[PDB]
């Protein structure tokens, strides 16, 4: 009973059966396929720097109605084009075309956050200084 072999000499069957079925586990399969290394925008890092290509406003999903302030960015390390998001009311005005921003994920591990369609990264710094300080004026943007 139970549909798994119980024999004392059945170890190979059990080990290989477990090995086959872990592929259905998304975390294990991502790790052993090397998806973060070969297909992620950041190449598997926590942070990445880039150059701003434009500004874009994205209409939020239902049931909200707003315009999220996001930038189109091309990363230094691999030239990939990603859309990042700038927090904190009054900070799209701190970023300009051909500025160098430092990015990070939203904390949902490569997924979108909140009502923002198709955006996976958040801007951390611009021109070498953090948005948190520029918002609170602890520092000013060097140009």
């Amino acid at each position: 009973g139970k549909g798994k072999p119980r024999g004392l000499n059945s170890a190979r069957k059990l080990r290989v059966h477990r090995r086959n079925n872990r592929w259905a586990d998304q975390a294990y399969k991502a790790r052993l396929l090397g998806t973060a290394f070969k297909s992620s925008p950041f190449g598997g890092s926590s942070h990445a720097k880039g150059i701003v290509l434009e500004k874009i406003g994205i209409e939020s999903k239902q049931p909200n109605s707003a315009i999220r302030k996001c930038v189109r960015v091309q990363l230094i390390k691999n030239g990939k084009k990603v859309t990042a998001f700038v927090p904190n009311d009054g900070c799209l005005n701190f970023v300009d075309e051909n500025d160098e921003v430092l990015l990070a994920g939203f904390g949902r591990r490569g997924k979108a956050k909140g009502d923002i369609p198709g955006v996976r990264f958040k801007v951390v710094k611009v021109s070498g200084v953090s948005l948190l300080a520029l918002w609170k004026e602890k520092k000013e943007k060097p140009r």
Binding site: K55, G57, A66, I67, D89, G90, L92, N93
Partner: peptide, 13 residues
């Protein structure tokens, strides 16, 4: 009734 990039920072300002 929509928004755009122009109204950035409105309420904090």
């Amino acid at each position: 009734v929509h928004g755009s990039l122009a109204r950035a920072g409105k309420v904090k300002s």
